[PDB]
Design a protein around this nucleic acid. Structure first.
Ligand SMILES: [Ca+2]
Ligand SMILES: [Ca+2]
Ligand SMILES: [Zn+2]
Ligand SMILES: [Zn+2]
Ligand SMILES: [Zn+2]
Ligand SMILES: [Zn+2]
Ligand SMILES: [Zn+2]
Lengths: 131, 512
RNA sequence: AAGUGAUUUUAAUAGCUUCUUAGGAUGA
RNA sequence: UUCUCCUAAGAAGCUAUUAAAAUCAC
C-alpha cells in the first residue's frame, strides 16, 4: 504494502481537522496558536507569464501569481471529509488555483478566507479592479 | 522514513494520480515529476472513472490549542474521574479485493457487554468528492479468531449503529457523570474506529438545558448533554487513556490474568473491554485509599454516611455496655476518632499503617487469619470496613456486600467492587466463608436517655423502660423510627453487619 | 496476490571526522 | 628535515538511505 502519501509533519494538523465539526475555524484556530502551516502541497512549475484568473482548468499564472494543484488546497479534500456545499461536489477539484505570491507559503489558508468574484474572474480585493 | 502511514493508498491499481484530483506531492504519479515540480502534459487525460480507498490508520492527537480540550488525559485526573470509564475494544477485517492494506471496524465491544456488528465501510476517493461505502472484506486467517466466520456476513449500516452507540452510552452514564473516559489497550486501531462516531470542538452547552455538552446531532445542529439526547448521532468531546503505557509487559490476557480469575471468553470483543477496564481498576485502586481526592455528591451520600456513623456509634456502645469487655481492639481506622468517647475500654490502634499523624500513638499491623488467629484473645476486635480474608471469633464486622449494584457501587476487580462515596473504597469479593466464626446481628435500639413526656408503636426490638411499660413515650417513638430509617437505608445501601457467636440481646435487659 | 505499527541484526550506498600511506607545491 | 594545503588509497565511527533473519506488539 500500500502506497503512502503523507509526511510525519502533517500528522497532527490532519488529525485535528479530521475530528472537527467546524473544519473552517478548526484550521484557523490552529494557525491562531501558531501551529505550522500545512506542508507538502502540490506545486506547479508554471511558465508563470499567463492570463491571471482566480481558478483555471489550464495552468496559468502572472508575475504576481503562483499556480497550484487543485485538489491540494481544499482542506476538506485534503482531510477527506464532506463538503459543506450542495451537489456535494468540491469546486476546487478540477482546476488550478492562482495564489498571490505573497501569501504563497500556506495555500490552504487563502481559499478559506477569500473567494472568487464572478464579474471579472479574480479573487475579489486582490487585483479584482472592480473599483 | 519521513513518510507516515496515515492516508496511505490502499488501491490495487498501479498508476498514480493527475496534478488535480491528487492530495499531496507523493500521491502524484511518477510520470510528470520533472525538477521536483509537476507539469501538466497535454496528453494524459485525468480520470473520470475511479474509486480508491484511503487508510484511516494511525492518527495522532498531540496538540495544545487555545480553546479545545485534550482528548488524552493524565492518570491523575483519570483517577479523579472514575465514574466515566467505558472499555473499548474493536475487531476488524482485512480489505481483500480491489483494495489492500488496511482494516475496517467490524465488531465494537463496550464495557457494558453489548457488541455491535457493522457492515465494513471505509472512506473511498472519487473524481468528485469522498464517499462512505462498502468494501470487499475477508476475515483474517487464524485459529485464534474463528467465530468471525458468519459475523461479517451479516451487518447493520453505519448510520444505525451510531444511534446505538449513543443509545447505549446515554443509558449508563446519564446519572453517573457528565463525561466519558474511554479506556483502550492498543490506542491505534481504536482511534480509527472513533473516526466513525466522534466529533470535537469548543466547549458548548446543551440547548434546552444548563449542563455541559456531550452529544452531537448532525440533523438538527444542536449539541446535548446526556439526559436530553434523544435522536442524536455522534459523540461530542470524549477522553481516552491507554493502559499499556503504564509500564506493562507483553500482551494483554496474561497481565490481567495474574489478578482476576473470572474474566475470559472465546474471543468476543465485549470480553476484551471487560479485562481492559478490570486492569486499570486493579492497577489504580486496589492497594490504597488516597484520602486526598474528594468526589462529588451524586445522591444520598450525606444521609448514608450519617446513618453509618450513627449505627456504628450505636452497636459498639451496646456491645461494650452488654458484655463488659475489658479491652476493645480497633482495626482499619486511618486516624484516631473514638466512636464512643464515653467508654471504659482502652482503645488501642491496630491500624493498617500510620496515616499522616502520630499524635494519638497509632500503631501498625496488617491482619491475616492464618497469621493472627491466636494473637488477639482478649476483649473484642472492631473490624469496621476491614478487608481481611477471615474475621476472628470475637468481632464486630461491618462489611460492604459487593453483590448489590447501584449508582454508588461500581464494578471492580476480582469480584470485589469499588464503593465510591466521598472516597474510593475497593472492598474485595463478599464470600460466606469469611463469616464462619460470626453471626448476623438482630435489629434493636438501646438508649440510656431518661424518658420525657402520634401513633403508638409496640415493638420488642426497641429496648427502653417506656416500651417495657404499657405505654410507649414520644421521647422514644421518634428515636426508634429514625433509627429504623437509618438501619433500613444502610442495609439497602449494602452494608452487612456481623456479631460474635456469644452475643445475647437479653443481657442488655438486666442492665436497667 | 499480497493487513497494521514498533523495536531489532546484517548487507549495499552516500555524507563527514580521525589515523596511516603515497604524490605535488610553498616556506626554514 | 620540518610546516601547511591539495590528490588518491586503507582503517574505525557517526548520521542518512536501500534490502534482507528474528523478536515484541494488534
Ligand atoms: Ca485494542
Ligand atoms: Ca482486543
Ligand atoms: Zn473539495
Ligand atoms: Zn471585484
Ligand atoms: Zn440538556
Ligand atoms: Zn479481571
Ligand atoms: Zn422514654
Amino acid at each position: 504494502a500500500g502506497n503512502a502519501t503523507e509526511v510525519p509533519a502533517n500528522s497532527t494538523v490532519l488529525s485535528f481537522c479530521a475530528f472537527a465539526v467546524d473544519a473552517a475555524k478548526a484550521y484557523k484556530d490552529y494557525l491562531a496558536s501558531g501551529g505550522q502551516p500545512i506542508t507538502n502541497c502540490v506545486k506547479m512549475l508554471c511558465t508563470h507569464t499567463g492570463t491571471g484568473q482566480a481558478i483555471t482548468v489550464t495552468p496559468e499564472a502572472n508575475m504576481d501569481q503562483e499556480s497550484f494543484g487543485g485538489a491540494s488546497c481544499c482542506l476538506y479534500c485534503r482531510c477527506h471529509i464532506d463538503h459543506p456545499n450542495p451537489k456535494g461536489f468540491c469546486d476546487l477539484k478540477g482546476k488550478y488555483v492562482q495564489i498571490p505570491t505573497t501569501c504563497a507559503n500556506d495555500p490552504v489558508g487563502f481559499t478559506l478566507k477569500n473567494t472568487v468574484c464572478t464579474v471579472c474572474g479574480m479573487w475579489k480585493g486582490y487585483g479584482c479592479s472592480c473599483d | 522514513e519521513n513518510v507516515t502511514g496515515l492516508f496511505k493508498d490502499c488501491s490495487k491499481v498501479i498508476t498514480g494520480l493527475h496534478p488535480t484530483q491528487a492530495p499531496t506531492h507523493l500521491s502524484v504519479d511518477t510520470k510528470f515529476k520533472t525538477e521536483g515540480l509537476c507539469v501538466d502534459i497535454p496528453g494524459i487525460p485525468k480520470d473520470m472513472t475511479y474509486r480508491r480507498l484511503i487508510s484511516m490508520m494511525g492518527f495522532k492527537m498531540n496538540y495544545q490549542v487555545n480553546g479545545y480540550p485534550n482528548m488524552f488525559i493524565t492518570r491523575e485526573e483519570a483517577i479523579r474521574h472514575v465514574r466515566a470509564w467505558i472499555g473499548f475494544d474493536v475487531e476488524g477485517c482485512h480489505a481483500t479485493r480491489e483494495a489492500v492494506g488496511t482494516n475496517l471496524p467490524l465488531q465494537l465491544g463496550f464495557s457494558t457487554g453489548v457488541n455491535l456488528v457493522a457492515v465494513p465501510t471505509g472512506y473511498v476517493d472519487t473524481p468528485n468528492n469522498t464517499d462512505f461505502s462498502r468494501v470487499s472484506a475477508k476475515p483474517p486467517p487464524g485459529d485464534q479468531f474463528k467465530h468471525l466466520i458468519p459475523l461479517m456476513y451479516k451487518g447493520l449500516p453505519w448510520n444505525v449503529v451510531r444511534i446505538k452507540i449513543v443509545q447505549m452510552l446515554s443509558d449508563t452514564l446519564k446519572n453517573l457523570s457528565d463525561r466519558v473516559v474511554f479506556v483502550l489497550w492498543a490506542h491505534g486501531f481504536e482511534l480509527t474506529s472513533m473516526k466513525y462516531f466522534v466529533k470535537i470542538g469548543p466547549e458548548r452547552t446543551c440547548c434546552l438545558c444548563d449542563r455541559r455538552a456531550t452529544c452531537f446531532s448532525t440533523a438538527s445542529d444542536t449539541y446535548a448533554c446526556w439526559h436530553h439526547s434523544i435522536g442524536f448521532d455522534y459523540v461530542y468531546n470524549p477522553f481516552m487513556i491507554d493502559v499499556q503505557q503504564w509500564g506493562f509487559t507483553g500482551n494483554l490476557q496474561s497481565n490481567h490474568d495474574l489478578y482476576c480469575q473470572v474474566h475470559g471468553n472465546a474471543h468476543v470483543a465485549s470480553c476484551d473491554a471487560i479485562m481492559t477496564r478490570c486492569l486499570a481498576v486493579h492497577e489504580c485502586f486496589v492497594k490504597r485509599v488516597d484520602w486526598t481526592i474528594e468526589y462529588p455528591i451524586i445522591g444520598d451520600e450525606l444521609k448514608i454516611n450519617a446513618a453509618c456513623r450513627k449505627v456504628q456509634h450505636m452497636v459498639v456502645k451496646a456491645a461494650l455496655l452488654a458484655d463488659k469487655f475489658p479491652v476493645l481492639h480497633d482495626i482499619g481506622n486511618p486516624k484516631a476518632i473514638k466512636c464512643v468517647p464515653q467508654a471504659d475500654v482502652e482503645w488501642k490502634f491496630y491500624d493498617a499503617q500510620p496515616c499522616s499523624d502520630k499524635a494519638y500513638k497509632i500503631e501498625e499491623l496488617f491482619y491475616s487469619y492464618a497469621t493472627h488467629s491466636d494473637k488477639f484473645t482478649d476483649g473484642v476486635c472492631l473490624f469496621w470496613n476491614c478487608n481481611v480474608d477471615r474475621y476472628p471469633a470475637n468481632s464486630i464486622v461491618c462489611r460492604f456486600d459487593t453483590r448489590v449494584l447501584s449508582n454508588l457501587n461500581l464494578p471492580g476487580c476480582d469480584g470485589g467492587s469499588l464503593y465510591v462515596n466521598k472516597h474510593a473504597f475497593h472492598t474485595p469479593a463478599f464470600d460466606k466463608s469469611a463469616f464462619v466464626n460470626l453471626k448476623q446481628l438482630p435489629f434493636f435500639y438501646y438508649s440510656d436517655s431518661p424518658c420525657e413526656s402520634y401513633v403508638p408503636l409496640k415493638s420488642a426490638t426497641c429496648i427502653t423502660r417506656c416500651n417495657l411499660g404499657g405505654a410507649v413515650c414520644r421521647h422514644h417513638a421518634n428515636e426508634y423510627r429514625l433509627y429504623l430509617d437509618a438501619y433500613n437505608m444502610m442495609i439497602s445501601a449494602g452494608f452487612s453487619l456481623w456479631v460474635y457467636k456469644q452475643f445475647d440481646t437479653y443481657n442488655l435487659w438486666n442492665t436497667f
